[PDB]
From a paper:
Here we determined the atomic resolution electron cryo-microscopy (cryo-EM) structure of the Leishmania ribosome in complex with paromomycin (PAR), a highly potent compound recently approved for treatment of the fatal visceral leishmaniasis (VL). Paromomycin (PAR), a natural aminoglycoside (AG) produced by Streptomyces riomosus, was recently approved for the treatment of visceral leishmaniasis (VL), a fatal form of leishmanial infection. To delineate the PAR mechanism of action in Leishmania we employed cryo-EM to obtain the structure of intact cytosolic ribosomes derived from L. donovani in complex with the compound. Taken together, the biochemical and structural data presented here indicate that AGs mediate their activity against Leishmania by interfering primarily with cytosolic translation, and that their induced activities in these eukaryotic parasites is highly differentiated when compared to bacteria and higher eukaryotes.
The nominal map resolutions for SSU and LSU were 2.7 and 2.5 Å, respectively. Multiple secondary binding sites were also previously reported in X-ray structures of AGs bound to bacterial ribosomes; as these were primarily localized to ribosomal loci with no presumable ribosomal activity, they are mostly regarded as non-specific interactions between the positively charged amino-moieties and the rRNA phosphate backbone. Notably, one PAR molecule was found to bind between H45 of the SSU and H69 of LSU, partially overlapping with the AG secondary binding pocket previously reported in bacterial ribosomes. The secondary binding pocket close to H69, which partially corresponds to the additional pocket found in bacteria, also implies possible interference with translational translocation and ribosome recycling. An additional eukaryote-specific protein that is localized in the PAR-binding pocket is eL41, a single short peptide that forms a eukaryote specific inter-subunit bridge (eB14). In addition to the clustered modification pattern of h44 and h45 of SSU, H69 of the LSU that penetrates the binding pocket is extensively altered with six modifications, three of which are of eukaryotic origin. These include the eukaryote conserved Am502 of chain β (A1913 in E. coli) as well as two eukaryote conserved Ψ moieties at positions 510 and 512. Given the close proximity of these modifications to the PAR binding pocket, we hypothesize that the local modification pattern of H69 might also be a key determinant for PAR-induced activity in Leishmania.
Author numbering:
A (entry chain O): 3 to 137, 144 to 225, 230 to 264
B (entry chain S): 2 to 155
C (entry chain D): 8 to 175
Write the structure that this text describes.
RNA sequence: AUGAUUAGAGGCAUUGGGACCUAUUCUCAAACUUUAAAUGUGCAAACAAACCGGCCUUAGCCAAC
RNA sequence: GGGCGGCAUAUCUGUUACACGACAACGCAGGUGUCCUAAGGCGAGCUCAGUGGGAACAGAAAUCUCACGUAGAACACAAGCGUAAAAGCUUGCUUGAUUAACGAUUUCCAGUACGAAUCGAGACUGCGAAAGCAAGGCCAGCGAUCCUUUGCGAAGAAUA
RNA sequence: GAGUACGACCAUACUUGAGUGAAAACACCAUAUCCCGUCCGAUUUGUGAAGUUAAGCACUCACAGGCUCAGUUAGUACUGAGGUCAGUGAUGACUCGGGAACCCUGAGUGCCGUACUC
């Protein structure tokens, strides 16, 4: 017939991978280099900005690697943004920026380093050029760990990036993968990036859904079921950043 | 061995154990090496970068140098009539921390366990009696050791 | 049984295997843009077989994966040339099947005097939704052995949607 | 597992004038090996040293101490 | 024995070699004096060899599709090590294959030189969102004094 | 008693085939105006929330293969020291010590850590 590949000899000599490699959760080739620090820094704390965006949630958490298992310092989620005035988005780019702000406000108040290192109380799209020791008092430094997400110029793991940066945390980055960045012109556009900080790109497409589904007779069903309107999407976030930045420890 | 290069006769020596292959683990990166510590140079192929020479593979010595991805370690090599101290420098994956002084830090901290029970309190664990003394034997089972006939038919 | 187990069409593969070095093939890439209406991609050879007149890394084929709405409208286009009758060995045990047309002008394509005639392949890929778990960056796993489309399962789908004549 | 190497058992359609597949088998390897000794080989076993609680210093490290 | 033959004359992997290291023979089995502006550097995406089911012409072999596939492929080369969201393949930008204050070290060792290599610090950079990686392609591929020869020590300041 | 995100050891965790799955979450799923990337909205990126536990995941079950752990093999093979030992020799026993391996058999089939949640 056909030769069986999976002989008993196949099973006897099979070397299984790591558990979170079989499960498809960890890139250990990047895990190793993110955790790697100088040996002359004799076990100094090094923090990762672990952002993980699921189908219905944004998970942003500050994590220190240990030999016994990684030690989460103050996680922050997107499903607890309804405690702040955002009932609707929760997986868009405008809730990436809110979860990153709400992470960098809960983290500095955890340290006591808030009311210093606050930064960009009203947001722009413009690049900041983060001050770190590789480059007075230094801000709290964590590096951004996308895990396995494809870092494209406009992605939502980079909205948590400017959430954390404009929340007072010091993450090293260049603006090459912000949404309002042009590859061949090599110049940032702060108009286009600020618009999806405050969810304007939802509002020109929530408008088309309420305008091309009222002339013609499932997209944005729970928003059309709600009384929510365009022109009330953009100011909904600006007011919701006040609810985050003034009191971030609130939740559901 | 007909060639006297750097990795010669290192066929089985720089190999990896069966179903133990792969790049080094995260607890090797996080393990921080400090100057003055006994480490234990064991060359890790799957790195192939900053390996020690084949002589320094079972060996263990004192760290004298810590650079960002390197460890210097002082290892004794006997040459003719003398034991001179070789200061090699490897990558950090080719050192393990040494448990050579584990049994000495154990009875050292037992000498602050004792002297914290003698000067202040009185509670001590009892001293252990030797099994080499002459006791009485109560035989709960006896046999006869006799080399039966049927012991040969095998 | 369960509405998540509706066998749909996943993809459709419009293979042309010209064989020539690229003289006739450059009007074989144009004959398929008048079809499926997205950009064709070329294909070179693996080895060099002397009897066939083909050498390595010379563009020898044109293929297209088409999905969505034209994955449906090119079997109704494509099974008119079969009269809804294709055999039982045209089906694979992985759940999919295929068939090969002999000349494309019997579809409804106007015959240009520049581009000649071409015979094609039409290999569909049948599957159920939930096949994403085998094609993911994170959490990539396998599809279990109740959710694969079978050969006996691709029998009845061809007899309940488009057709009904296997004619073994 | 790789390299050798005898032989019987049928799988029945997987073929052509034992190929193929599955379990076993007789017999082996300086340049094969899952496993693995005996003999060896490195380091440590409190007097320039480690141990325990403040201090001074440093343009070392860390957001800070 | 010397001669012819050869290279065991500088040198690399396996074995001899006797489970640290070191170990001889015109002992065994093969390599070396080259090769590469990418076959270097890096980021991203991808999975290889092979087999099985399938699809006009189209067969054992052309190309499409699906499944299984611990590496059975590949990494310029002898061999051994090593390697799978890579070290392989494809692609994208690149020049770290430059400089590197006479830093220290390893292998051979007389602890000499050479060749090769490792761990650094300084300049300027490359790729990357970042952590990082990179001062060739790991590990063989090479050479004293003397002589020849080239590069650097721009001009413009300075009452010295 | 469980989920999710980061995990440490890296099969007692794997492979195949069945079974079951409260909540919540993960997940398939819907979609293409913007950001973005493709032969292809497949992957990927964005924006969603009608549907379903079919599949992933989780757990449970195999006179399952594997793996892990003892036991047996077995004081057997082998070996350090010894002899004006035995044997034509090949080699063998003895003496003072050390002491395996596969087959086989039995067992059970992940475990620990941080943050958030049902
Ligand atoms: Mg001259």
């Amino acid at each position: 017939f056909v030769k069986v590949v999976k002989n008993k000899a196949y099973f006897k000599r099979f070397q299984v991978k790591y558990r979170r490699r079989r499960e498809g959760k960890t890139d250990y080739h990047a895990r190793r280099q993110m955790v790697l620090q100088d040996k002359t820094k004799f076990g100094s704390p090094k923090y990762r900005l672990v952002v993980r965006i699921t189908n219905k949630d944004i998970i942003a958490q500050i994590v220190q690697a240990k030999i016994v298992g990684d030690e989460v310092v103050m996680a922050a989620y997107a499903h607890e943004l309804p405690a702040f005035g955002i009932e609707h988005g929760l997986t868009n780019y405008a809730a990436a920026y809110a979860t990153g702000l709400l992470l960098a406000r809960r983290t500095l108040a955890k340290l006591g380093i808030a009311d210093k290192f606050q930064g960009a109380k009203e947001a722009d799209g413009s690049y900041s050029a983060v001050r770190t020791k590789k480059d007075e008092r230094f801000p709290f430094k964590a590096i951004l760990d996308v895990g396995l997400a494809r870092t494209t110029t406009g992605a939502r793991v980079f909205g948590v990036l400017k959430g954390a940066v404009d929340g007072g945390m010091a993450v090293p980055h260049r603006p090459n993968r912000f949404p309002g960045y042009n590859k061949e012109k090599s110049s940032l556009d702060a108009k286009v990036h600020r618009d999806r900080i405050f969810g304007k790109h939802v509002a020109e497409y929530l408008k088309q859904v309420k305008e091309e589904a009222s002339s013609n007779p499932v997209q944005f069903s729970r928003y059309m079921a709600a009384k929510v309107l365009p022109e009330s999407i953009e100011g909904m976030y600006k007011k919701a950043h006040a609810a985050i930045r003034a009191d971030p420890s609130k939740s559901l | 061995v007909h060639s006297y290069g750097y990795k010669s006769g290192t066929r089985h020596l720089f190999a990896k154990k069966f179903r133990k292959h792969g790049a080094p683990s995260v607890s090797t990166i996080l393990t921080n090496i400090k100057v003055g510590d006994y480490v234990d140079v064991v060359a890790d192929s799957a790195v192939r970068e900053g390996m020690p020479h084949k002589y320094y593979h079972g060996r263990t010595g004192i760290v004298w140098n810590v650079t960002p991805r390197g460890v210097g370690v002082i290892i004794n090599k006997p040459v003719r009539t003398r034991t001179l101290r070789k200061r090699i420098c490897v990558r950090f994956e080719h050192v393990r921390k040494s448990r050579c002084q584990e049994a000495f830090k154990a009875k050292e901290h037992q000498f602050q366990a004792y002297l914290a029970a003698k000067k202040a309190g009185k509670a001590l664990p009892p001293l252990k009696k030797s099994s080499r003394m002459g006791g009485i034997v109560r035989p709960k089972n006896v046999e006869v050791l006799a080399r039966r006939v049927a012991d040969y038919e095998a | 049984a369960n509405p998540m187990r509706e066998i749909v069409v996943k993809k459709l593969c419009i293979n042309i295997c010209v064989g020539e070095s690229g003289d006739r093939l450059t009007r074989a890439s144009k004959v398929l843009e008048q079809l499926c209406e997205q950009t064709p991609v070329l294909s070179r050879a693996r080895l060099t077989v002397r009897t066939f007149g083909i050498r390595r890394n010379e563009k020898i084929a044109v293929h297209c994966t088409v999905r969505g709405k034209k994955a449906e409208e090119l079997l109704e286009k494509g099974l008119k040339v079969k009269e809804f009758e294709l055999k039982s060995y045209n089906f694979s045990d992985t759940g999919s099947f295929g068939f090969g047309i002999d000349e494309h002008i019997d579809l409804g394509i106007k015959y240009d005097p520049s581009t000649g005639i071409y015979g094609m392949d039409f290999y569909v890929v049948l599957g159920r939704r939930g096949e994403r778990v085998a094609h993911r960056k994170r959490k990539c796993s396998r599809v279990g052995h109740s959710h694969h489309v079978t050969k006996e399962e691709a029998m009845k789908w061809f007899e309940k949607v488009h057709d009904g004549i296997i004619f073994q």
